[PDB]
Design a binder for these strands. Structure first.
Ligand SMILES: [Mg+2]
Ligand SMILES: [Mg+2]
Ligand SMILES: [Mg+2]
Ligand SMILES: [Mg+2]
Ligand SMILES: [Mg+2]
Ligand SMILES: [Mg+2]
Lengths: 164, 138, 66, 169, 257
RNA sequence: ACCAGGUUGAUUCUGCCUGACGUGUGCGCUAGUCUUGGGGACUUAGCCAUGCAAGCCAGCGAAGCGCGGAGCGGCGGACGGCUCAGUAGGACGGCGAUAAUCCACCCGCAGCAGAGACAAGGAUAACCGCGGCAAGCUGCGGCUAAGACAUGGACAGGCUGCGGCGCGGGGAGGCGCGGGCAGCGGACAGGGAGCGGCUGCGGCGGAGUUGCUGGCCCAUCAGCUGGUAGGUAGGGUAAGGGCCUACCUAGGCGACGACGGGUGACGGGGGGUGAGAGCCCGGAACCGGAGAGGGAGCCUGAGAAACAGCUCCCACGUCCAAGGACGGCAGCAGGCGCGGAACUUGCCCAAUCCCGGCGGGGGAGGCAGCCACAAGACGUCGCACGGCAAAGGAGUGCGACUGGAGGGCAAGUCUGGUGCCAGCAGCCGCGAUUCCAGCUCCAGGAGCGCACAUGAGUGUUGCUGCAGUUAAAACGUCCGUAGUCGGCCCCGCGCUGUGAGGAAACCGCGGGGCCCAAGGCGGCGGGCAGCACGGGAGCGGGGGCGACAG
């Protein structure tokens, strides 16, 4: 039948908060994003991850913190960049699940290769270093990417370099 | 009616309370069917009959350039207000114009009294296209 | 990535594989199958004809001759 | 034709039902085959599922048993003496189930005197049944349904079952 | 609508067949053969999705035309033939003999068996009825029927029937302590030993089962297929052996205990 | 889990209005690329030109010149597709029942009449001619087939009545089977491409009935009911039944809301929105129902009260040589009409599948086109390659608007015009910080604005959780029945835990480098005041108190 879909972004409830409208834009001008939707996607993706953790810390079933909590932390470590949890089953999950609630949207915004090109001093010009991604100059290990919100992983983070 | 076995009494009672709620009162009565102008369907389209002189509610003193319009789907004669300064000369008699509401849930907007609908397109081309000159009336 | 098949005879190839892929290699076109719109009208005329075509065409032109 | 549905009926509370859909063949009934006496004519019907139901239109004889001795004959039907549901059905001599009918006594009295030759006590046990036999009156009920089976089988009335019915006609 | 449904939608197909959503609108409607539709899969699923002999129906038509497929010792040259639980698919080309059986993922799986295990199959009886002339012939759940069996064979028993011979060679009763296979339900594809039988006069006898691992579950006895007595298994067991490992056990192997 | 503006000279409230957010429907302006999905449901279940959409075959095999393919015969056309008018329970959902029932394909079993039997009888279509007729359609003659239609021949199954012990199953029996007497009745005279017929038992696949239960509004709808409620008996049906009839009882339902009405009501899986309780929606993928212009009746068949079958009536429409003949796009495109509102008279069976015993057919279906309708990702021209049923695209490969700038509300007391005019403004408001332009600036951004509807805002519907001295609101009083609520002590039921069984889609979660993403695909879960088991408490039953209860 039909393939399912979802809404990536959301809009704020009060659209003209002058306090928010510059705290958005400094988080936007740091990473040089196209629009607020690119920022509000990661602000949503970080939020329901925080909303996921807050419903695991409430849980009565300790199997749930075992199954979904280690799944959430490995999601933070492997595809994300968290890089500190042992998964020991010595309740370092609950030490780290309460570290999920302090994560910002900017914690996810740095993970994109638009930022990661700048992390190894590769193109030095973030406001138009995206021109090199858009014209296919940045190449991960064997494949070229023209999607600057690529969200690079743990293992892939060193293996980035410019190609021609 | 607060006992543990009062659910059918509470549903019977609170529904009779809810009939006094004005938002639920219109859905209960079906007033959007009683006036087929803009309630059940948006964008009523009809034939212009005459240009109307109507004066704004005081303290504001101006003259809004309304028009009577007879609808095609109903034959109802409703008055509609023309926005977008100087547009009243761009619409003529026996035109077929489309009408929209004011965003006031069926009431008058601002200084205009009685006029609950406003024109957006004349002869299936918009007034925003004519107020700036983007399109042309056929 | 290529998913390729390794047959053992040309005859099992043209039998098992679909008819368009042997048109890719060699261009057989063994069945004409005129066109879909032509084959519909050709069959739909044959459906209303009772009996053989020769009895129907003879009775038709005999009335056309008159 | 006639239907079997309750879509025309009222509800238990007396409410009238709305009749909207067209009639189905799932619930279709038929005419009463008012089976009468005459030379045998049975009607064949390809009814539901192709099975052939035979209803008797006219019907001459019935396979009637004597339950006391376990012997049977197909004696001819003479007239319906009693019908339980309506006396209209006995005036027209309509053969249905449970209809008390007057049978042909000749074939039954031949074996009945033959067993009466050996056992003399048999006639004294029910004097009323053997009273009507010498007069030639022999009565039975149809137990089969002639509109469904196409036959008029049953048993000879004897005993208190007989005196129950001869008070009814 | 109403009548014999000739078509079958892809979403309405049984999820044990493991058909994708985006494969098409329709799924292959099985023929009305030996197994019920809830407990069967067609041949045309096995020969393209499981064994992948044919990628195309034109290839699949050729395979059934040349009659190389043979299930329960009969050729069965039908595209939509319903093969069910315990039935043995034996292909003389490739010399591959498989028995259709469930998996832990609640799906049908073709389990490779030996050439000697392919000579028989197991059938759960449905009813037991004297035929005309006094022939006491029983009826299996897959629509097979056999006569002159052991009189001790009553309902819910599984019988070991030969394939190449139409007789029943082995009998397995439905008591406590028997190795059971769970055909339908939440515990589909689980192998366990029957602990208790609760009768429930009127309807739905309930069987209590603990597996080899020790996990206890309850099912209807109609969803209970005996595969062995206490000493032995009468069939080979598939991959995973019907354990149905828990989600935390799936979690603990990835990250340690 | 949010408020903000607005009653005043100022205040505190009540109170509504409006802003602020999601959603879907339409409009408007604008527009670079790609993937994916959607799209005449709402008004008109309105009207339809033209083409296409359900055909196929292996028995028999004519013409035509062994090939052949007509007709007979057979199978399907009752499925899919479309639509949502009717439907307030004939539905649907959940749980059942059918010991009250029928059956095609297919599967597994048993079987199929010795009859002259090394054998089967009369036909008819095709065809050969001769025709009628504007057309649609049809006649006469001559022959000739069968897995068509018969004949022949009864061991069984079957039917009915009566009799009647047991053996099996089932919760429960003359349900199955064996044993009886009668009356009926009743399964192979086929073939040198695989077999094909028929009878029965068991499935499968269906189907009909059916029980319990749940689900909108109106009391300015309070009493309703006559085949109505029941009994007996028969009829009828595949089948229980007031289903029907005959006779007889006087019942049946109702404030625990009957009955009647309304609905711009198909139901559900579900969807939207909210922290939640809720509120709202469900035309729309899947399931069930219903319909084919309005109807009714039916034939054939296993299955239709069929409609791309028939018969008739009605309302529209067409052709005619005037005698007659036809049409039903709520199938696919397309046209008109309707409206706010919805695409090409494209290509093809390649994929998904279905019919047919295979070569065939399939507007089911896919592919493409149209459309900013939606989701997602990304900017500011021609070869070869590549894929494709075919083409095109993907993939290598070379040569910037939209809205605003007084407050709410982010951003101008800049410039020119306008002078209570024109105009603007959801609310407050302005008449030049608000009009109309220019500039600049702000907001979102290939999108944005508007209208309508709905949710939240709203504890302004209040179960959670409102308010009733004076803001809207305690009925003049008392009695009073249903209703609802209710003292103390001392097996059944409520409640509750687990479990069964419960479709996928969906949703929640979890993976998973489709370049990312939305995804695909694979795991795991939830759903039900139905069912089973458990439960220390609670309630009944019965005694004892005698309540700052009476
Ligand atoms: Mg003739
Ligand atoms: Mg003749
Ligand atoms: Mg309706
Ligand atoms: Mg629906
Ligand atoms: Mg449907
Ligand atoms: Mg007051």
């Amino acid at each position: 039948a039909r393939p399912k879909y979802s809404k990536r972004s959301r809009v704020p409830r009060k659209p003209y908060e002058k306090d928010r409208l510059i705290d958005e834009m400094k988080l936007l001008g740091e990473f040089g994003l196209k629009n607020k939707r690119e920022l509000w996607t990661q602000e949503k993706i970080c939020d329901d991850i925080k909303k996921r953790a807050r419903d695991l810390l409430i849980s009565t079933d300790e199997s749930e913190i075992i199954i979904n909590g280690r799944a959430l932390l490995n999601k933070l470590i492997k595809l994300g960049i968290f890089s500190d949890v042992d998964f020991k089953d010595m309740d370092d999950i609950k030490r780290n699940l309460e570290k999920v609630l302090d994560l910002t949207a900017s914690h996810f915004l740095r993970r994109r290769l638009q930022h990661r090109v700048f992390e190894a001093c590769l193109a030095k010009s973030v406001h138009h270093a995206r021109n090199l991604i858009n014209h296919r100059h940045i190449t991960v290990r064997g494949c070229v990417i023209d999607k600057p919100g690529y969200m690079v992983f743990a293992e892939n983070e060193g293996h980035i370099e410019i190609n021609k | 009616m607060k006992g543990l076995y009062c659910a059918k009494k509470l549903k019977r009672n609170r529904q009779a309370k809810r009939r006094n709620d004005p938002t639920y009162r219109k859905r209960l009565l079906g007033t959007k069917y009683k006036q087929d102008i803009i309630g059940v369907a948006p964008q009523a389209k009809g034939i212009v009959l005459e240009k109307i002189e109507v004066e704004a509610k005081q303290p504001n003193s101006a003259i809004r350039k309304a028009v009577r319009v007879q609808l095609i789907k109903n034959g109802k004669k409703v008055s509609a207000f023309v926005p977008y300064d100087g547009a009243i000369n761009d619409i003529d008699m026996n035109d077929i114009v489309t009408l929209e509401g004011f965003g006031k849930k069926g009431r008058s907007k601002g200084d205009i009294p009685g006029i609950r609908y406003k024109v957006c397109k004349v002869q299936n081309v918009s007034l925003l296209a004519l107020f700036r000159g983007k399109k042309d009336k056929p | 990535k290529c998913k390729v098949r390794i047959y053992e005879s040309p005859e099992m190839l043209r039998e098992i594989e679909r008819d368009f892929v042997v048109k890719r290699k060699t261009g057989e076109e063994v069945r004409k199958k005129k066109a879909r719109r032509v084959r519909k009208k050709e069959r739909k005329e044959k459906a209303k004809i009772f009996g053989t075509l020769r009895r129907h065409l003879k009775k038709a032109e005999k009335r056309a001759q008159k | 034709g006639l239907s079997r549905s309750n879509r025309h009926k009222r509800t238990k509370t007396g409410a009238k039902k709305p009749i909207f859909c067209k009639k189905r063949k799932f619930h279709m009934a038929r005419q009463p085959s008012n089976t009468k006496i005459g030379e045998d004519k049975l009607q064949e019907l390809r009814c539901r599922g192709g099975v052939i139901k035979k209803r008797a239109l006219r019907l001459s004889s019935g396979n009637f048993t004597c339950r006391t001795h376990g012997f049977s004959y197909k004696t001819k039907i003479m007239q319906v003496m009693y019908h339980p549901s309506s006396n209209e059905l006995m005036r027209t001599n309509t053969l249905t189930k449970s209809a008390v009918i007057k049978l042909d006594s000749k074939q039954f009295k031949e074996k009945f005197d033959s067993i009466l030759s050996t056992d003399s006590e048999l006639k004294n046990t029910d004097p009323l049944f053997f009273s009507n036999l010498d007069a030639g009156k022999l009565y039975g009920v149809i137990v089969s349904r002639p509109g469904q089976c196409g036959r008029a089988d049953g048993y000879i009335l004897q005993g208190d079952e007989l005196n129950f019915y001869i008070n009814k006609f | 609508t109403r009548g014999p449904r000739r078509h079958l939608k892809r979403l309405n197909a049984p999820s044990s067949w493991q058909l994708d959503k985006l494969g098409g609108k329709y799924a292959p409607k099985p023929s009305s053969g030996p197994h019920r539709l809830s407990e069967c899969i067609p041949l045309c699923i096995l020969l393209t999705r499981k064994l992948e002999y044919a990628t195309t129906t034109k290839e699949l038509k050729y395979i059934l035309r040349k009659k190389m497929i043979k299930v329960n010792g009969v050729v069965r040259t039908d595209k939509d033939f319903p093969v069910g639980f315990m039935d043995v698919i034996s292909i003389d080309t490739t010399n591959e003999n498989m028995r259709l059986l469930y998996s832990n993922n609640r799906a049908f799986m073709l389990h490779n068996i030996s050439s000697e295990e392919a000579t028989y199959r197991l059938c759960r009886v449905s009813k037991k009825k004297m035929g005309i002339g006094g022939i006491p012939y029983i009826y299996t759940q897959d629509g097979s029927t056999f006569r002159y069996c052991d009189p001790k064979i009553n309902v819910n028993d599984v019988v070991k029937v030969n394939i190449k011979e139409k007789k029943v060679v082995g009998f397995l009763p439905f008591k406590s302590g028997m190795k059971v296979f769970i055909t339908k339900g939440k515990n589909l594809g689980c192998i366990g030993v029957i602990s208790g039988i609760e009768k429930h006069m009127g309807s739905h006898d309930i069987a209590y089962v603990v597996d080899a691992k020790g996990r206890s579950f309850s099912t209807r006895t109609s969803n209970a297929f005996i595969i062995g007595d206490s000493e032995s298994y009468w069939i080979s067991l598939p991959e995973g052996e019907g354990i149905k490992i828990s989600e935390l056990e799936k979690s603990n192997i990835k990250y340690g205990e």
